[PDB]
Design a protein around this ligand. Sequence first.
Ligand code: NA
Length: 152
Amino acid sequence: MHIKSAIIVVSDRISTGTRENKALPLLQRLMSDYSYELISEVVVPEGYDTVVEAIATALKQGARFIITAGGTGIRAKNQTPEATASFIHTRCEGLEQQILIHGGLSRGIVGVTGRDDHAALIVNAPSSSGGITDTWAVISPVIPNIFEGLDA
Ligand code: NA
C-alpha cells in the first residue's frame, strides 16, 4: 500500500530562506518505515490563499495524505486551519482531541476530503518539531485504519 503523500511547510521565514526547513526532513524520517510515497514537498508563505493553492495542487497531483506544518496560531496570517477546512468533507475531531491529550493555541485540524478510495486525509501539524512528533504519534497508528475504511 503506497500512500501518495505531500508535505506543505507554512512559514514566512522558511519561505524566504532565512530559517531552516526542519519540518521536511523530520517528516521524512517519521514516514520512513504500507509505505509513504512523497510526491511533493513545498514551503509557502503564511496565509489562506497560499495554503489553499498548495493543498489543491497536491490533491490534483493525486496526493491522498497531505500534512501541513505551521500557520495554526491566532495571528491574522495564520490561516492553515481555515484553508484546510475549505477541503474537508468529514472532520476527525477525535484525532485532534487525542493529539492534544497526548501533547492549546494550535487550531490545526484533521479530516478527509471524501469517503471513498479517491479521498485524501489532511493533517495540520504545528511548526515545532515537538508538535510535529506529537501529531505523528497519534496519526501514524491510525493511518492503516483510515485508508482501509476509505478504500472499502
Ligand atoms: Na503552527
